[PDB]
């Protein structure tokens, strides 16, 4: 039903070709095992021939007679074979791809046209709800998914099933035993892969749980960067982050170990089962004599059919995910729930006017629970008059103008145009009788002529002229070049807004509506153009029944009737003089108011250089990958020798040879492969593991030892940084895993394969490499044309999507409705190009895949053709034919593995490129000296002179300009300002988070500019608004080692004693040893702040800094904290910028700072004697 039928809906002849293509997909999938059925037949005759050839040792010429007769007959069959299958798979290939294109093209084109129509046909609803943009984004991504859902993926699916069910048909028919054995290994092969999913899923979460700690540490630290910097607690986080990395690495190595165990055992069970299939298949030959080895290989082709099932699964997932996502939104996509607007029928009034009548209208905006903006309404405006509406709190007038266009059906009551209800008349016609001028004009991107033409489709420039000329818009446009043909470039901001609105007026003037609606058209406009446009409206007024709402009262002066609302509630109505006579609401208002990343630059081989630099030794892993590489072909060689000697060889010695090769196939693979695979996995696993350690170490430390606008004021974010730590190291880990994987298959194919290739007749080599590279290039150029078409398509739909998003983002088109069908018309014309392009790629994708399979039979042809014929002619041998098959499986594991690890190398290279440029850093400040720390350095009297500053957004209106202060030691320096910054920034600059643009700052009179950064941050009293508490023992939180400072119990005791946090410390379990309980979930702001205070006074700073400490707080907490702050200070210098002016009353020096410029300075009573900003601040404190 709705799931499928609609998904596939319409397409009368399309459904038919869909079935023709489907059928061809069936016979395509059917063809492959038949091709392999042929492989057994050619094997059969050739085997019988070989058995007599070695059985001779007497006669020679007879083998030259009969064996060659049979071989010639088989060549005769061969010719009808490659050809017979080839022409078929070629045609049916072009057809099955025609499914991918011809059907999808018309289906998608129909979907697009209906979707694009229905969206505009929903009208009000989109404004009522959902995303209006994010929605049309995802939706077009879903329709993009549909192309993947209804494409040849289905054709491939049926092809696969044809190879599966059709494969097993032949298998079961030619024997039921071997079937049972393979069916027995099916759950077993499914069993080992089951171990995989359990291991992968389990080990991921462990590593995630491990890195979560590393992530959490990275989470808070990077957020607390200004704090850790100020306290210089970097090296401890350094060590912890190394410990957590140590654990995440140990779970990493165990993961790799188990992984290699799984893949290894899986392949063991595969080759073991394969060998068992042969041992019993042979056992059915030597003594039994049932199979000649046809089905023995064919059942392996049944394994290839199961792999076809594995290729089938994605196609279903491609179909299902396309189905499920589409049909569910399809209910929204199609039809027209509508039923408040529509496009059609209704009643057409010829009375061409109607005294507007509003009767008892109760309405609520579709915000649901929001109260009715308009409760009840009564308004009757006689024809030809101009009624003015007014209000205060906003809207409520705008609602009535909105209702007049029937944009919202009123909850209760009715609005009557003429005598009839408004809901009887055709909506489209109503829209045509209603002109609307909004306060904020909008012009579509087109000629002014076209924007007017959007008012009325059928028009001539003469009417355009009369329109603008009556709208007095005919002046600036003539002076303007291109005249009426002048486009409005880059949306609507080009020329004066008054001119824009005036043009909108000309557009509504062409409409010649019998009702005119003006909403604050004059409002939000410069005075001059206001008077001009107003004059235009006036000439547009008096001629049409209209209703005008604005907050401009001069134009209301000449109105025939005025109606007051103030919130939408109707009270007074009538002429201006009558209203002023009432001295009501009208008179009252008139007179009272009188996250993305990754810059482009790459690595360029610096990768393996730095890697090897950080990779001390691993030659056993890669060498083991080499011996495993050369291990792979031996299997292909042994089996080649098995059937080889089985084909050519006599009845004697068959048992010994077959047994020996069977066992050799066993020990060489099952025993050795597991060993070498687990050995390398254990090597490069730990390699990537320790790389994962050292890299993230040398990154995060390079991150913490540099701040300097990467932290203080980055355009980046915490998440982007954590993301960097994850992705970069994970990617280079895959880079090295790919390194060993590639060298492994490299020697596996090139190295051993060349050696095997060398013993051919040398023509066979050339003919073979006249295929493989050619079909490889054909597949590459296929991939290139593929992406080229995908991209050009993306460009076309890009443009159509842009003008579509343009339409849907502008809902004001519905007020005109003229463009409803016109827009879908332009969209139709826009979509017409990809349509023909869809037809174009029908031929293109069709020939590519066809040719790909055209090379398939052609490959098998020349292989067996030349394998027979000329080779058959002189010295026909059992070898060199199966070695071709070996070279084939090497080209398969080559293309397969290389192409699989190719994109892994890409993203890694890019990710590595980022991680390299970041670690180079710009180390700047760490330790050094700059001073010898003389025994005579204390005081704490801080100087500021002519200091200007801006945080690293340069033209951000620097908060400090021409600033100078002074503070004596042992006393409190108060600070107060308007809002925002300059409060906090002074404190920030004292941290030397950023060195100011000009001027200087002193602490002992020495230059902070020239002072060492570390020792400057060695004495600081910094307290933020909402102190961030690290997850750790609260005792360890209280004491942050400044430099050498050990955790001191008696000290932190004194800290709690002073901070009044000792209350919680006395009682409760674990006391000081109590953990923060998952990010301080157990404490309120007051408690955390108490702890922050303890952190401050632990260090015993000669300088304290309070940034809005008490800003967030209440009741007793404010008093106990204020008490703590006061007992914390007065022993040392402190700076308080706090917004509590109630608590500022005790200060040695209070300073009024005006936006970078210190305005007033002095003691409380002195400034109180003065007057200005400060007194206003206290007066507003109340």
């Amino acid at each position, epitope marked *: 039903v709705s799931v499928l039928t609609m998904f596939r809906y319409a397409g009368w002849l399309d459904r038919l070709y869909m079935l023709v293509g489907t059928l061809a997909a069936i016979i395509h999938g059917v063809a492959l095992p038949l091709m392999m059925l042929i492989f057994g037949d050619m094997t059969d005759s050739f085997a019988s021939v070989g058995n007599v050839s070695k059985n001779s040792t007497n006669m020679s010429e007879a083998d030259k007679r009969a064996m060659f007769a049979k071989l010639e007959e088989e060549m005769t069959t061969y010719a009808y074979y490659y050809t017979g299958i080839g022409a078929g798979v070629l045609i049916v290939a072009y057809i099955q791809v025609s499914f991918w294109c011809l059907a999808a093209g018309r289906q998608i084109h129909k979907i697009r046209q209906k979707f694009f129509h229905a969206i505009m046909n929903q009208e009000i609803g989109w404004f009522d709800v959902h995303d209006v943009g994010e929605l049309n984004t995802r939706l077009t991504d879903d329709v993009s998914k549909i192309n993947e859902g209804i494409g040849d993926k289905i054709g491939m699916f049926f092809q696969a099933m044809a190879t599966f069910f059709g494969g097993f048909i032949i298998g079961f028919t030619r024997g039921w035993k071997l079937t049972l054995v393979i069916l027995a290994i099916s759950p077993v092969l499914g069993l080992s892969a089951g171990i995989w999913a359990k291991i992968l899923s389990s080990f991921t979460d462990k590593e995630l749980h491990a890195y979560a700690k590393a992530g959490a540490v990275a989470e808070e630290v990077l957020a607390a960067i200004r704090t850790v910097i100020a306290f210089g607690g970097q090296k401890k986080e350094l060590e912890r982050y190394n410990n957590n990395l140590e654990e995440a690495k140990r779970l990493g190595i165990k993961k790799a170990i188990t992984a290699n165990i799984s893949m290894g055992a899986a392949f063991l069970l595969i080759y073991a089962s394969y060998a068992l299939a042969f041992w019993y298949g042979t056992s059915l030959v030597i003594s039994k004599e049932y199979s000649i080895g046809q089905v023995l290989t064919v059942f392996f082709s049944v394994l290839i059919g199961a792999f076809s099932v594995g290729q089938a699964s994605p196609n279903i997932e491609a179909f299902a995910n396309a189905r499920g996502a589409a049909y569910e939104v399809f209910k929204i996509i199609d039809n027209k729930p509508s039923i408040d607007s529509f496009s059609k029928s209704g009643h057409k009034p010829d009375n061409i006017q109607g005294n507007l009548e509003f009767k008892n209208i109760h309405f609520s905006y579709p915000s649901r629970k929001e109260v009715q903006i308009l409760k009840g309404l009564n308004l009757k405006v006689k024809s030809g008059q101009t009624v003015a509406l007014v209000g205060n709190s906003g809207c409520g007038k705008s609602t009535t103008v909105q209702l007049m266009q029937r944009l919202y059906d009123p909850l209760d009551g009715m609005v009557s145009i003429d005598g009839q209800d408004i809901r009887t008349i055709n909506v489209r016609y109503l829209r045509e009788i209603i002109g609307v001028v909004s306060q904020e004009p909008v012009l579509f991107a087109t000629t002014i002529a076209e924007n007017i033409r959007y008012g009325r489709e059928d028009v001539t420039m003469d009417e355009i002229e009369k329109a603008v000329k009556e709208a007095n818009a005919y002046d600036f446009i003539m002076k303007l070049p291109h005249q009426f043909d002048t486009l409005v470039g880059e949306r609507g901001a080009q020329l004066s807004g008054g001119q824009k609105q005036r043009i909108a007026i000309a557009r509504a003037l062409v409409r010649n509506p019998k009702i005119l609606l003006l909403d604050e058209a*004059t*409002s939000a406009l410069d*005075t*001059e153009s*206001e*008077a001009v446009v107003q004059a235009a409206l006036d000439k547009a007024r008096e001629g049409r029944t209209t209703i005008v709402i604005a*907050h*401009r*009262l*001069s*134009t209301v*002066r000449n109105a025939d009737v005025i109606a007051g609302f103030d919130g939408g509630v109707i009270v007074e109505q009538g002429n201006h003089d009558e209203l*002023m006579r009432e001295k009501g609401i009208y008179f009252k*208002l*008139v*007179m*009272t*108011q*009188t996250l993305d990343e990754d810059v482009p630059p790459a690595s360029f081989w610096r990768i393996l250089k730095l890697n090897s630099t950080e990779w001390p030794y691993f030659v056993v892993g890669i060498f083991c990958a080499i011996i495993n590489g050369g291990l792979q072909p031996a299997f292909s060689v042994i089996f080649s020798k098995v059937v080889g000697v089985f084909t050519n060889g006599g009845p004697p010695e068959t048992q010994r040879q077959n047994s020996n090769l069977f066992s050799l196939l066993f020990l060489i693979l099952g025993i050795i492969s597991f060993i070498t695979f687990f050995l390398q996995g254990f090597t490069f696993g730990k390699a990537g593991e320790i790389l994962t350690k050292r890299l993230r170490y040398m990154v995060f430390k390079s991150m913490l030892r540099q701040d300097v606008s990467w932290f203080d004021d980055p355009k980046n974010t915490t998440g982007a940084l954590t993301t960097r730590l994850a992705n970069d190291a994970a990617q280079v880990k895959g880079a090295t895993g790919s390194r060993l994987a590639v060298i492994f298959q490299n020697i596996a194919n090139l190295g051993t394969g060349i050696i095997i290739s060398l013993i051919y007749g040398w023509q066979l080599t050339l003919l073979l490499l006249a295929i493989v590279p050619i079909i490889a290039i054909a597949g590459v150029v296929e991939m290139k044309m593929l992406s080229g078409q995908a991209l050009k398509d993306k460009k076309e739909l890009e443009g159509s999507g842009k003008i579509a998003t343009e339409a849907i983002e502008n809902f004001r088109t519905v007020v005109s409705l003229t463009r409803e069908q016109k827009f879908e018309t332009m969209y139709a014309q826009s979509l017409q190009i990809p349509y023909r392009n869809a037809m174009k790629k029908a031929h293109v994708f069709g020939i590519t895949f066809s040719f790909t399979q055209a090379m398939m039979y052609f490959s098998y042809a020349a292989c067996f053709r030349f394998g027979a014929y000329l080779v058959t002619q002189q010295l026909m041998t059992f070898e060199n034919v199966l070695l071709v098959f070996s070279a084939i499986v090497f080209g398969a594991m080559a293309v397969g593995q290389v192409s699989s690890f190719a994109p892994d190398y890409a993203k890694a290279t890019v990710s590595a490129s980022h991680i390299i440029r970041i670690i180079e850093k710009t180390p700047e400040i760490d330790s050094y000296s700059t001073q010898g720390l003389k025994p005579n350095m204390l005081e704490g009297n801080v100087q500021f002179s002519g200091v200007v500053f801006n945080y690293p957004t340069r033209p951000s209106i620097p908060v400090l300009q021409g600033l100078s202060l002074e503070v004596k030691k042992g006393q409190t320096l108060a600070l107060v300002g308007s809002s925002g910054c300059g409060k906090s920034t002074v404190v920030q600059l004292l941290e030397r988070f950023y060195d100011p643009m000009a001027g200087s700052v002193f602490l002992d009179g020495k230059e902070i500019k020239q002072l060492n950064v570390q020792w400057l941050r060695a004495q600081l009293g910094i307290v933020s608004q909402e102190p961030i508490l690290f997850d750790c023992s609260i005792a360890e939180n209280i004491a942050y080692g400044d430099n050498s400072r050990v955790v001191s119990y008696e000290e932190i005791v004194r800290a709690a004693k002073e901070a009044n946090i000792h209350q919680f410390i006395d009682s409760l379990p674990d006391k000081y040893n109590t953990r923060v309980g998952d990010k301080g979930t157990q404490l309120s702001g007051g408690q955390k702040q108490r702890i922050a205070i303890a952190r401050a006074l632990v260090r015993q700073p000669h300088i304290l800094l309070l940034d809005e400490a008490t800003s967030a707080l209440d009741t007793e907490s404010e008093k106990v904290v204020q008490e703590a702050l006061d007992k914390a200070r007065e022993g040392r210098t402190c700076i308080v910028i706090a917004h509590r002016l109630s608590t500022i009353q005790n200060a040695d020096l209070i300073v009024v700072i005006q936006n970078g410029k210190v305005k007033e300075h002095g003691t409380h009573q002195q400034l109180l004697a003065q*007057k200005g900003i400060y*007194f*206003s601040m206290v*007066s507003v404190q109340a």
Partner: nanobody, 118 residues
Framework: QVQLQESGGGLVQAGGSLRLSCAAS????????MGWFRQAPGKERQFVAT????????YYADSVKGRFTISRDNAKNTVYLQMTSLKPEDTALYYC???????????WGQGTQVTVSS
């Protein structure tokens, strides 16, 4: 393009008449009236009086009404408000302001400070 100046703004004791005037020169004709203000530091701004450039009458505040008077140039744009009997409360900065079609004060001038005693 607009600006409003004041003339006569000075000092006087309780019971004195302080006649003021507001000169308005710029561009506007639709309903731009002339209106005066009064504000004190540490407090919001309060209004005074306003004649309508229509031909109706004036609007006096329930603080200053009965006492204060207002006028026009009669050949040109100005407003002469005679301030009769100013209490020490009156003491404030007075800045004349002009109408806006919108009807929310967008026009302002120079102002003048007035000090009253006993």
């Amino acid at each position: 393009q607009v600006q409003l100046q004041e003339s006569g703004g000075g000092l006087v004791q309780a019971g004195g008449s302080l006649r003021l005037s507001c000169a308005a020169s710029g561009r506007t004709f639709n309903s731009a009236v002339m209106g005066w203000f009064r504000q004190a530091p540490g407090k919001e701004r309060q209004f005074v009086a306003t004649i309508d450039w229509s031909g109706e009458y004036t609007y006096y505040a329930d603080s200053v009404k009965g006492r204060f008077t207002i006028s026009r140039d009669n050949a040109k744009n100005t407003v002469y408000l005679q301030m009769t009997s100013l209490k020490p409360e009156d003491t404030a900065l007075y800045y004349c302001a002009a109408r806006l079609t919108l009807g929310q004060f967008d026009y302002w001038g120079q102002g003048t400070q007035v000090t009253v005693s006993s």
